[PDB]
Amino acid sequence: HHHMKNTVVRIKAELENVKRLFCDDEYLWIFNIRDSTSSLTRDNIQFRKTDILEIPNSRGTANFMIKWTEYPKYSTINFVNTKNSCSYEEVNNNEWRDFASFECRGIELIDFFPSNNFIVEDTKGKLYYDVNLSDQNWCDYNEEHEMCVGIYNLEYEVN
Amino acid sequence: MKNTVVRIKAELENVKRLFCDDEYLWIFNIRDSTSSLTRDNIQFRKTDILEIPNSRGTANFMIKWTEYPKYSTINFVNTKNSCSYEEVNNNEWRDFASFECRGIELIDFFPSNNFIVEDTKGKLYYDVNLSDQNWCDYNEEHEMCVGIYNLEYEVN
């Protein structure tokens, strides 16, 4: 019923005193999507890589599904586990880097929206939670070592 | 705390029961229980497993309505004879399915096309499409017309 496409989210950000930016299983993926076979679109779909949806007439499962029309075709997204997926590190400072891949069947990822469940470790090893990058920028201060920690000009693309 | 309930009513011809199974696609328009925000045409099955933060429980549907760290949920609730509408209650309103909703109000229901019917002679019909509120088919062996007409429905 589909051609399956593999789709990558790439990010780039300028790093100050950050060892890695990353996310966990709780991370909330947010996209605007489109039907790969029609003009239909859906904004702000939300899902996690742990979500388990059983696909009809298949033994497989999906993290996100949609039945675009009254006809009996189901369209799916699955997060693809790759090793060191979902991590951006000091060494990648200001360079584009593959962040996460998805198998999409019947669906095109149009727009990605970073959420606010990122995690940051700084170079002194302390962790920051609920890191909000929906506005593409974030900083905090390490009081222990009196150190600014920042993520600037967050850029991304979905291809 | 109360369940939200989808009720239906139809005219049956030679139908033992109208029912649905695990694969049935629940379709709703919904609203934030605390704001004017809405979401149309959400879709789930009763078997969907989404992990709810701050609980061991899972949900069949969830949504984060705003950037405030708080998730709202729908879960199918099993109840007596749920998801089955029978000959004995022909042309009557009956509770068809129940839903535990947290942070979400169900506003509109949309019957889908994967209902099942058992006719009064034992025959089963799959992929029964009532999204347009009427369905019929025919039992050849027994030469009888089988149908569901003027389906009506509500959720609250």
If you had to describe this structure to a student in words, what would you say it looks like?
It is classed as structural genomics, unknown function. Two copies of one chain form a homodimer. Helices cover 0% and strands 57% of the residues of chain A. The first copy, chain A, has a six-stranded antiparallel beta sheet with strand order 7-8-10-1-15-14, with no helix packed on it. Chain A has one domain. Chain A is elongated. Chain A starts with a strand and ends with a strand. By secondary structure, the first copy, chain A, is mainly β. Chain A has strands spanning 4-16, 18-22, 29-35, 41-47, 53-54, 61-62, 64-66, 75-80, 87-89, 97-105, 107-112, 118-122, 127-131, 138-142, 147-158. The A-B interface holds A 26, 28, 46, 48, 50-54, 56, 65-67, 70, 72, 116, 130, 132, 134 and B 22-23, 25, 43, 45, 47-51, 53, 62-64, 67, 69, 113-114, 127, 129, 131.
Write the layout of secondary structure elements.
Two copies of one chain form a homodimer.
Chain A (H helix, E strand, L loop, with lengths): L3 E13 L1 E5 L6 E7 L5 E7 L5 E2 L6 E2 L1 E3 L8 E6 L6 E3 L7 E9 L1 E6 L5 E5 L4 E5 L6 E5 L4 E12 L1
Antiparallel strand pairs in A: 1-10, 1-15, 2-9, 2-12, 3-4, 3-11, 5-6, 7-8, 8-10, 12-13, 14-15
InterPro entries (chain B): CXXC_Zn-binding_euk (IPR008584)
GO molecular function, one term (chain B): zinc ion binding
Family (chain B): Belongs to the UPF0587 family.
